[PDB]
Enzyme design. Structure first.
Site, PDB file in Angstrom:
ATOM      1  N   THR A 174      31.101  40.855  34.960  1.00  0.00           N
ATOM      2  CA  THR A 174      32.171  41.265  34.058  1.00  0.00           C
ATOM      3  C   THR A 174      31.754  40.861  32.645  1.00  0.00           C
ATOM      4  OG1 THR A 174      33.789  40.907  35.828  1.00  0.00           O
ATOM      5  CG2 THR A 174      34.663  41.115  33.595  1.00  0.00           C
ATOM      6  N   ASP A 201      36.594  38.487  46.434  1.00  0.00           N
ATOM      7  CA  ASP A 201      35.662  39.515  45.938  1.00  0.00           C
ATOM      8  C   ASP A 201      34.204  39.048  45.842  1.00  0.00           C
ATOM      9  OD1 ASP A 201      34.419  41.789  44.905  1.00  0.00           O
ATOM     10  OD2 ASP A 201      36.009  42.213  43.458  1.00  0.00           O
ATOM     11  N   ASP A 205      30.371  36.963  39.964  1.00  0.00           N
ATOM     12  CA  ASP A 205      31.578  37.641  39.477  1.00  0.00           C
ATOM     13  C   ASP A 205      32.769  36.703  39.279  1.00  0.00           C
ATOM     14  OD1 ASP A 205      32.698  39.941  38.393  1.00  0.00           O
ATOM     15  OD2 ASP A 205      33.425  40.702  40.317  1.00  0.00           O
ATOM     16  N   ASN A 227      39.540  37.140  40.099  1.00  0.00           N
ATOM     17  CA  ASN A 227      38.990  36.917  41.441  1.00  0.00           C
ATOM     18  C   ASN A 227      39.359  35.563  42.053  1.00  0.00           C
ATOM     19  OD1 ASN A 227      37.860  39.462  41.384  1.00  0.00           O
ATOM     20  ND2 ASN A 227      35.760  38.757  40.997  1.00  0.00           N
ATOM     21  N   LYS A 270      35.734  35.085  37.583  1.00  0.00           N
ATOM     22  CA  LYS A 270      36.755  35.415  36.587  1.00  0.00           C
ATOM     23  C   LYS A 270      38.136  35.112  37.183  1.00  0.00           C
ATOM     24  CE  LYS A 270      36.448  40.332  37.830  1.00  0.00           C
ATOM     25  NZ  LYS A 270      36.123  41.673  37.275  1.00  0.00           N
TER      26      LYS A 270
END
Ligand SMILES: *C(=O)CCCCCCCCCCCCC
Lengths: 350, 20
Positions: free
Chosen positions: A201, A184, A166, A171, A168
């Site tokens: 995502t 996260d 995840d 985060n 991005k």
């Protein structure tokens, strides 16, 4: 680190020793996880710092010490309904076991009748996302500074057989020293083989996730390519109004670069945003070393980054303890705890 | 410009994580 500075390769035995000791530390905590190390009445709830489909993150103040923390609160009934039990159990088990300078530290965890709680170190500098959108884009040395921290973090996480899944700007938190703190771990997983869950995502999904092929840790390296692109360009390599249109662009095998991108940056990104798994950097015989030895990272002192000795591009404004200026406002809602235990068996190990 | 197209798009704000 002087040895590395002198010539490349003389630290390979030293890096091997570091990760071996790091794995020993991790596995001890992985095999016997901590539980129930705090309780709700030990904290004052101040302000929501972020929201999700089944939970929220709040700035809290530890009553006894006065220390501020970021408390992640997850609704157990929501988790079950969205079929996220295993993922949530993954997140907590991994977080209580890891230890790295660019990962946000889990300080306490506990549960009650209604909720799961993960108490993290408070990082007041805000999400990279917010700074990136405001400024527009980062310069290449700016982006490189952040990229290097992710490379080292992935080198750490992958060595423990962990896949992050995840990556991005949302985060990635900026601390008081201007360094990255990864947050996260909702999709994090310890896996030695390949895995199949469609998660992440849209903009950051590797083609093999989209195509339902089964995938490994190479998806994190693809995500790094997307992140570096977005940081340096100000927009992601694949964007549209709807997820469907994004997925079509990702699988096409085609990327366009801004004219201001250096030749070195374009080459690295072609190697990271590679649809062919047998050609993607980070997934070859030399693994992470293909990335760390790339021309774009020629000015990067990897040990100095780890030791946090490198001057950061910018230090976020800090108005003292408990300041939320670097975070956006969210709708506040009362935390309700039921008199009946919800989903007890499902979350026994939490 | 690509930048203008991005800013005019519906995905410039915080992007939610997805799962099936
Ligand atoms: C200097 O050249 C001596 C070599 C020792 C290096 C060990 C320092 C820690 C390694 C940090 C790399 C992080 C790996 C994820």
């Amino acid at each position: 680190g002087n040895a590395a500075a002198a010539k490349k390769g003389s630290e390979q035995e030293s890096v091997k020793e570091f990760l071996a000791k790091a794995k020993e530390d991790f596995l001890k905590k992985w095999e016997t996880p901590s539980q129930n190390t705090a309780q709700l009445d030990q904290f004052d709830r101040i302000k929501t710092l972020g929201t999700g489909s089944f939970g929220r993150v709040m700035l809290v103040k530890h009553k006894e010490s006065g220390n501020h923390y970021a408390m992640k609160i997850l609704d157990k009934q929501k988790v079950v309904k969205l079929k996220q039990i295993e993922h949530t159990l993954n997140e907590k088990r991994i977080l209580q076991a890891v230890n790295f300078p660019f990962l946000v530290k889990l300080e306490f965890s506990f549960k009650d009748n209604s909720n799961l709680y993960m108490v993290m170190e408070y990082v007041a500098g805000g999400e990279m996302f917010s700074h990136l959108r405001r400024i527009g884009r980062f310069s290449e040395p700016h982006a490189r500074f952040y990229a290097a921290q992710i490379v080292l973090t992935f080198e750490y996480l992958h060595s423990l057989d962990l896949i992050y899944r995840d990556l991005k700007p949302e985060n990635l938190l900026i601390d008081q020293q201007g360094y990255i703190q990864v947050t996260d771990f909702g999709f994090a997983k310890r896996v030695k083989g390949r895995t199949w869950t469609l998660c992440g995502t849209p903009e950051y999904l590797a083609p093999e996730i989209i195509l339902s092929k089964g995938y490994n840790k190479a998806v994190d390296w693809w995500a790094l390519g997307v992140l570096i692109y977005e940081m340096a360009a100000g927009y992601p390599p694949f964007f549209a109004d709807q997820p469907i249109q994004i997925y079509e662009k990702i699988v096409s095998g085609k990327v366009r670069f801004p004219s201001h991108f250096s030749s070195d940056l374009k080459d690295l990104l072609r190697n990271l945003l590679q649809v062919d798994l047998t050609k993607r950097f980070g997934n070859l015989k030399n693994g992470v070393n293909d990335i760390k030895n790339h021309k774009w990272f020629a000015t990067t002192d990897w040990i100095a980054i780890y030791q946090r000795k490198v001057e950061a591009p910018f230090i976020p404004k800090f108005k003292g303890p408990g300041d939320t200026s670097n975070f956006d406002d969210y709708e506040e809602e009362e935390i309700r705890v039921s008199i009946n235990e919800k989903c007890g068996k499902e979350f026994t190990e939490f | 410009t690509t930048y203008a197209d991005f800013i005019a798009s519906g995905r410039t704000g915080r992007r939610a994580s997805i799962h099936d």
